[PDB]
Amino acid sequence: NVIQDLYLRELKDTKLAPSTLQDAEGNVKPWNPPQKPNLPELELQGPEALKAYTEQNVETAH
Amino acid sequence: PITGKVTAVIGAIVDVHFEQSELPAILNALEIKTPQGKLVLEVAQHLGENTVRTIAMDGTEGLVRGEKVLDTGGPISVPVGRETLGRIINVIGEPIDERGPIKSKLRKPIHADPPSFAEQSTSAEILETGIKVVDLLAPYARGGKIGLFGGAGVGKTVFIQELINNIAKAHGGFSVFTGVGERTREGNDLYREMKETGVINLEGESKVALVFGQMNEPPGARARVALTGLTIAEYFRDEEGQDVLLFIDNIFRFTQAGSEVSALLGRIPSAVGYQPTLATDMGLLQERITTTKKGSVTSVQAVYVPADDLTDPAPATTFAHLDATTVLSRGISELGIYPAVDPLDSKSRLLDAAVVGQEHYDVASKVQETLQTYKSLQDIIAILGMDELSEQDKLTVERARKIQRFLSQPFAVAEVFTGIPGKLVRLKDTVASFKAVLEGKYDNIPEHAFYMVGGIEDVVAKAEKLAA
Amino acid sequence: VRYEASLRQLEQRQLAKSVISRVQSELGNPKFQEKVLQQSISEIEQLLSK
Amino acid sequence: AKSAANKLDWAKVISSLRITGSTATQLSSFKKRNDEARRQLLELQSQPTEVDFSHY
Amino acid sequence: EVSSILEERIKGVSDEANLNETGRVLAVGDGIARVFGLNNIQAEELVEFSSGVKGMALNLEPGQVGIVLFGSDRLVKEGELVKRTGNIVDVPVGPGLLGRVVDALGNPIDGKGPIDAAGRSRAQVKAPGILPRRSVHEPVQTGLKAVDALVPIGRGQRELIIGDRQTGKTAVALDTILNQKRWNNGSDESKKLYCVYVAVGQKRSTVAQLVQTLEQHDAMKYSIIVAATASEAAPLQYLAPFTAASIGEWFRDNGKHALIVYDDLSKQAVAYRQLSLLLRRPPGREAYPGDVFYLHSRLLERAAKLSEKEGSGSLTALPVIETQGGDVSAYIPTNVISITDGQIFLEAELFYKGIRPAINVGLSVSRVGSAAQVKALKQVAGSLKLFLAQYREVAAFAQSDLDASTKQTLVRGERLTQLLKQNQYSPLATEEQVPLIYAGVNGHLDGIELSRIGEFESSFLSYLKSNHNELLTEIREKGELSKELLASLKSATESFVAT
């Protein structure tokens, strides 16, 4: 077609250059770094608690 | 050039004879220069013999048969943009805010084919809202059409305003309050009030864009107001990617406007008067609202059921399109609950076990069950006495009444209006609020200490000060 | 992946309007004359094929 | 173990059923139950811990 | 990429064509056009407009031909050239339509691949005569117990499903489609149904969710979807069931078993109404045109269990009627009811009142359904329909003195009702349904307090498989209960009841 000729020419002579990396970034937040919340809270730390608990706990009903 | 002479003006139905081989096409827009301004006519037929039959969108009075008309070439193209934010624009796409020519970016035809089946969003999403009542029992959804039912001016307008405030937090989007068949008196109030609650700042940020469509406007132009508003929304959705929310006024008056246009077009009326093209016309309006890849419109509609007959075709067609219904009630508002929303009456299809997850669902179901049993129980419990409550029964009565006060939370927009600081509580925190109340962790706290409060965490503090 | 698919669509519509632009350019030319001649002889061939 | 924890928990419930052995023991049982119930949903919460790059 | 595909499209539209006739439009609007010429037009031909849309010639008059525009009014305009397609309205039909959503013309609106179709076939075709018909004899199982014995359904059988708007109306049918995977994903091709889901007048978004649901249950690969959404134009909707039924017939006329769900014919009524009114034919009752009866009847009777001569074809029809305002005497519904064989009325009160879905069995009939049922599911379920229409009576007059006999019936009835209940998208195997019904019939749900009925069901099934899945395998293959099987089940049920 006259179209076929037109297209071929058009396509060749008009090349879209790919979008900037920043614009891609704008629509997609990049990477995810290691979660790293590190150490969580201490678990039942020291026998200080234990001494308190041994003494406190005696409250057992019949 | 493309010109034609007016060859009839029977009613607002103007037949225009155009010179041969230059003829319009169906749904094109013709403009008659007038000392009244312009008359925009929309071609709805070809009568042959180089004549068409068009309908008018402006008053046809004083027209002289033989005025030259000029053809726009296609459906009315209204300016759209970020400039349209906070501008009152009439249906013929011209500023009626009297802040002068809106700085047009692009303009777009009012008729715009609904998004492709391929580009449909394959699964639903939940549009977050601040309102806890909404967020539990009828959670808003992206894309969806959620049709408000209830009172009017009872805070109805304010409920809509609340949503605008929330929308700014929720996304930061825009809105378009489209009013079809809007009393010009009511419109004045809406504009001044909307300015006052700052959702419109004429000197600044405006989320809501206003399109006001008075009842005095021709029935055809009343019909086209809706399509115009939708076009504004599509610029937001498609071309700003935004999720936006478009309010419509009476969709009864949408139907009413349409029925008339059919009758004017001389078509045989379909059952209960409504247009024979009732289904298709509504279909176009409510399928141009959806979640596309780009964005999603979401539409809040007002359904003014005629004769309160849900059997009536105009409601029936609406109910087919609707996904959820929010049922504001004045009885509930009279219980002092603001939200006005009657929780049991509201029903949603966006509240589903899969959709909101099992936990949210289970919490909701329990909250429904507690309230449902409570209301029925309270009927004869009130008569019989609270002493005729079992331990199980008074547990529910207690739990329910704690929920009942807890449901109410002030609105940011109505911070001024009630006087009480607004509460906008995030969706995650809403689930949390009800979970705790279900586990009755803080249920032992006064009813007034749960009255008009935010989330559970918030009301732990308020409970201490209120009690003290 | 979403932005990639979106970019293919964006590319397609940009390149679509470039075709339209080239169409508007060709029909101005005396290709408007010469391809009408092509149609004329083609119509001769077609009409002879009946 | 968790199966140990629950068998002994309910055993202590039926021991406390006779001579009460729970007062604040059951509050300990409640705490271990809480996090134990967290672990099963944790183990169910797990999905592949590495990004897909064969297909994806 | 995008360049190559575009270049491919151009290469694929190269070369001229030999056009031989046209007519020219004179007057158009109200979605009908009046064309001048086309004297060679066949009746009900498909014409292609200059705009590119297609229409079906309806009124052939001596001076005008009146095309009916199959959507798109905007693009059509006066003095356009209408060229004859030359063919009566046909739609591509074939095996390859499996796993393709298509619109009415046959354009894949999911856009998944190009059409793979054996033939194209005219939209209206004569129904199977009396002589090529042979009565039903194979069951269709929906995995809903109430349906599968109290409202029995076979193959090649028309069987209306009627009830109130958006009660997930679609879900009742959907469950049948899903359940059919124990024969559809089941190997036996002498048991393969090929099921067509026609979505007419439904939200395009909702349909896309449905499609996604079907693709989630990996069911798309055994099914065809025809779609004529709410957005899609009313004349397309008019031709939409008819075209779908043509697609079904290709399977049927291979002798293969198939099923078609026409959801919702109530929206077809509104469409034909629109079309008729815009053709200004005299408004019929309730403004539904006077030829509406013919429209439904011609559609409905084109499905059927063919005879052995025809290779025992079957096309099981399930037409889904949306009672407006729950009016069960409405003109369109009553007209449909008379055409259809059996109806499956669903009750709104029960739906709200704790069954989702809630299949009312009082107003559900199936005219010849019971003859297609598996003998096991006749034996175990013997008279349970009667029993629960004694329960219906019992609770009618319960609200009053109750005899111990009445109380026994009430206790059985209420508890049986609990047993019927099932939740959406959770189907039950044919084998599995047999013992559960055996239990209830044999009154073992008097043995289970009302609260624990749900526990009984799941536990009983787990128990049965663990105790002896050998029995269930026997009921699976034998499909009938011998005296030994009856005793074995009695013994087994008693065994589970104890634990």
From Swiss-Prot, chain A:
GO biological process, any: mitochondrial proton-transporting ATP synthase complex assembly
Protein localization: Mitochondrion; Mitochondrion inner membrane
Gene Ontology annotations for the cellular component aspect, listed alphabetically: mitochondrial inner membrane; mitochondrion; proton-transporting ATP synthase complex
Keywords: ATP synthesis, CF(0), Hydrogen ion transport, Ion transport, Membrane, Mitochondrion, Mitochondrion inner membrane, Transit peptide, Transport
Signal peptide as annotated in the record: none
Additional free-text comment from the UniProt record: Present with 6140 molecules/cell in log phase SD medium.
Function: Mitochondrial membrane ATP synthase (F(1)F(0) ATP synthase or Complex V) produces ATP from ADP in the presence of a proton gradient across the membrane which is generated by electron transport complexes of the respiratory chain. F-type ATPases consist of two structural domains, F(1) - containing the extramembraneous catalytic core and F(0) - containing the membrane proton channel, linked together by a central stalk and a peripheral stalk. During catalysis, ATP synthesis in the catalytic domain of F(1) is coupled via a rotary mechanism of the central stalk subunits to proton translocation.
The family this protein is said to belong to: Belongs to the ATPase h subunit family.
Protein name: ATP synthase subunit H, mitochondrial
Protein encoded by which gene: ATP14
Portion of the full-length sequence here: 33 to 94 of 124
Curated annotation (Swiss-Prot), chain B:
Subcellular localization(s) per the UniProt record: Mitochondrion; Mitochondrion inner membrane
Note: Present with 164000 molecules/cell in log phase SD medium.
Keyword list, A-Z: ATP synthesis, ATP-binding, CF(1), Hydrogen ion transport, Ion transport, Membrane, Mitochondrion, Mitochondrion inner membrane, Nucleotide-binding, Phosphoprotein, Transit peptide, Translocase, Transport
Record Gene3D superfamilies: 2.40.10.170, Bovine Mitochondrial F1-atpase, Atp Synthase Beta Chain, Chain D, domain 3 (1.10.1140.10), P-loop containing nucleotide triphosphate hydrolases (3.40.50.300)
Residue numbers carrying Phosphoserine: 333
Gene Ontology annotations for the cellular component aspect, listed alphabetically: cytosol; mitochondrial inner membrane; mitochondrial intermembrane space; mitochondrion; proton-transporting ATP synthase complex
Gene assigned in the entry: ATP2
Signal peptide (from-to): none
Record-listed E.C. numbers: 7.1.2.2
UniProt cross-references to Pfam families, sorted A to Z: ATP-synt_ab, ATP-synt_ab_N, ATP-synt_VA_C
Subunit structure: F-type ATPases have 2 components, CF(1) - the catalytic core - and CF(0) - the membrane proton channel. CF(1) has five subunits: alpha(3), beta(3), gamma(1), delta(1), epsilon(1). CF(0) has three main subunits: a, b and c.
Residues that bind ATP: 150-157
Source species: Saccharomyces cerevisiae (strain ATCC 204508 / S288c)
Protein name (database record): ATP synthase subunit beta, mitochondrial
Swiss-Prot record, chain C:
GO cellular component: mitochondrial inner membrane; mitochondrion; proton-transporting ATP synthase complex
Family: Belongs to the eukaryotic ATPase B chain family.
GO biological process: protein-containing complex assembly; proton motive force-driven ATP synthesis
Keyword Transferase among record annotations: no
UniProt name for this protein: ATP synthase subunit 4, mitochondrial
Remaining remarks: Present with 12900 molecules/cell in log phase SD medium.
Broad class of where this protein is predominantly found: mitochondrion
Keyword check for Transit peptide: yes
Intracellular or extracellular location(s): Mitochondrion; Mitochondrion inner membrane
Span covered, complete protein: 193 to 242 of 244
Function field: Mitochondrial membrane ATP synthase (F(1)F(0) ATP synthase or Complex V) produces ATP from ADP in the presence of a proton gradient across the membrane which is generated by electron transport complexes of the respiratory chain. F-type ATPases consist of two structural domains, F(1) - containing the extramembraneous catalytic core, and F(0) - containing the membrane proton channel, linked together by a central stalk and a peripheral stalk. During catalysis, ATP synthesis in the catalytic domain of F(1) is coupled via a rotary mechanism of the central stalk subunits to proton translocation.
Keywords linked to the UniProt accession: CF(0), Hydrogen ion transport, Ion transport, Membrane, Mitochondrion, Mitochondrion inner membrane, Phosphoprotein, Transit peptide, Transport
A GO term, aspect molecular function: proton transmembrane transporter activity
UniProtKB/Swiss-Prot annotation, chain E:
Protein's UniProt keywords contain Transmembrane: no
CDD domains named among the record's database cross-references: ATP-synt_F1_alpha_C (cd18113), ATP-synt_F1_alpha_N (cd18116), F1-ATPase_alpha_CD (cd01132)
GO cellular component: cytosol; mitochondrial inner membrane; mitochondrial intermembrane space; mitochondrial nucleoid; mitochondrion; proton-transporting ATP synthase complex
Key word Acyltransferase present: no
Cellular compartments annotated: Mitochondrion inner membrane
One Gene Ontology term of the molecular function aspect: ADP binding
Any one GO biological process: proton motive force-driven ATP synthesis
The protein's role, per its UniProt record: Mitochondrial membrane ATP synthase (F(1)F(0) ATP synthase or Complex V) produces ATP from ADP in the presence of a proton gradient across the membrane which is generated by electron transport complexes of the respiratory chain. F-type ATPases consist of two structural domains, F(1) - containing the extramembraneous catalytic core, and F(0) - containing the membrane proton channel, linked together by a central stalk and a peripheral stalk. During catalysis, ATP synthesis in the catalytic domain of F(1) is coupled via a rotary mechanism of the central stalk subunits to proton translocation.
The protein's name: ATP synthase subunit alpha, mitochondrial
Species the sequence originates in: Saccharomyces cerevisiae (strain ATCC 204508 / S288c)
